[PDB]
Every structure is written in C-alpha cells, then in structure tokens.
C-alpha cells in the first residue's frame, strides 16, 4: 500500500487516529476538523484529550468544544509549514512532498533536541544543588 511511516500525511489516517474523541457533531473540533488541521490523537491516562500536529509535533490538550483546530493551531505554532499547504496531498508534486517530509524530519529532530536539552538542564540543577548543600 502506502508506506506506513508516511500515513500521518493523509487525513484518513489522521481521523482514524481518533479512537475516542470527546467532541462530536454539534462541536467545532471534530476528529475531522482536527485531522484537517493536522492533529493526531495520542491519548494517555493523565491526558486522554492529547492531540499533536504530525508535522511540527506541537502538542496540546484541554481542548474546548468550540475551539476550531485551525486557529488553535496558528495561535500556538505559527511556523508550521503544513498550515501553508493549501493543496490536497494527491495534488502534491513529488518534489514538494519530499521537501515537506524533509522539513518534518527536521522538526522531529528539533523537538527531540529541545527535549534532551531540558532533561539535561534539570539534571544539571540537581547536581549543582547537591554540591551546594555539601558546602
């Protein structure tokens, strides 16, 4: 079929990702409006409302039934390229699509780096405190 590292790229997989979504017809953020905005449902015990853009990897929760996933998406990560893409996936050029997947993989990397950075900082401050206590 279509390689399953690349599926986030098509709405159908994205909606499919919403196994249980609190919001539904009558509400502005349905799994369809969500996917259409590039969100994925990555639920957990502590937060099973958690959605994440498949492109820029921004995560967010505490959704409200009247939030519109698109403006909620511009007002949080404005630099998302996916937002700039106004054409259906199938009408994308292989070059365009490849450029896109590039930028994605990069954004993934930046996210993981930011993460490692914070983790390290925390550990840094722990160790420092300890050694200060010993003073």
């Amino acid at each position: 079929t279509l390689p399953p590292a690349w599926q986030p790229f098509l709405k159908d997989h994205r909606i499919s990702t919403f196994k249980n979504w609190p919001f539904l017809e009558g509400c502005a953020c349905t799994p369809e409006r969500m996917a259409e905005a590039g969100f994925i449902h990555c639920p957990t015990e502590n937060e099973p409302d958690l959605a994440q853009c498949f492109f820029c990897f921004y995560e967010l929760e505490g959704w409200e039934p009247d939030d519109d996933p698109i403006e909620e998406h511009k007002k949080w990560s404005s630099g998302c390229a996916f937002l700039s893409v106004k054409k259906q996936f199938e009408e994308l050029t292989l070059g365009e699509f490849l450029k896109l997947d590039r930028e994605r993989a990069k954004n993934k990397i930046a996210k993981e780096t930011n993460n490692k950075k914070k983790e390290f900082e925390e550990t840094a401050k722990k160790v420092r405190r300890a050694i200060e206590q010993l003073a």
Partner: peptide
C-alpha cells in the same frame, strides 16, 4: 487549548 493549552500547551503540554
């Protein structure tokens, strides 16, 4: 909505 709010950032994790």
């Amino acid at each position: 909505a709010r950032t994790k």
